[PDB]
C-alpha cells in the first residue's frame, strides 16, 4: 500500500 | 465553512511547499501536509505509512521521531493541536 492511499484513508 | 488558522510552525511548513495564505479548509491543510512529507521524502520507502520527523520541522510540531499514517485519530489530534479552528 502506497503512502498516498494510507493518507487517502486518513482523510476520506 | 469554518476555515482554520495554522499555528506558526505548521503555517511555516505549509508555506514552504507552495501555500499562499494564512487560513484554509482542513482538506487544504491535509493536501499541503501530505505534499510536504512526500516532497521531503520523509516517508519510509518499504513500509510507506511510516514517517520520520527526527531533525525536521515536522517533529518540531508533532513532538515524536516517527509516526504511522494508519493512526488516524492520533494524527488528526496532533494536526488540530496545530490549528485554531
Author numbering:
A (entry chain B): 1 to 12
B (entry chain A): 25 to 109
Q: Which statements did the authors publish about this structure?
A:
In this proof-of-concept study, we firstly used PMI – a potent dodecameric peptide antagonist of MDM2 and MDMX that, despite its high affinity for both proteins, fails to activate p53 and kill p53+/+ tumor cells due presumably to its inability to traverse the cell membrane and susceptibility to proteolytic degradation. Previous structural and functional studies of PMI (TSFAEYWNLLSP) identified Phe3, Trp7 and Leu10 as the most critical residues for MDM2/MDMX binding.
Whereas all 12 residues could be built into each PMI(8,12)-a peptide complexed with MDM2, PMI(4,8)-a was fully defined in only 3 copies of the MDMX complex with no density observed for Ser11 and/or Pro12. The DTC staple rigidified, at positions (8,12), the C-terminus of PMI in a helical conformation and extended, at positions (4,8), the C-terminal helix of PMI from Leu9 to Ser11. The rigidity of PMI(8,12)-a or PMI(4,8)-a increased to such an extent that the local buried surface area (BSA) slightly decreased as compared with the BSA contributed by PMI to its interface with MDM2/MDMX.
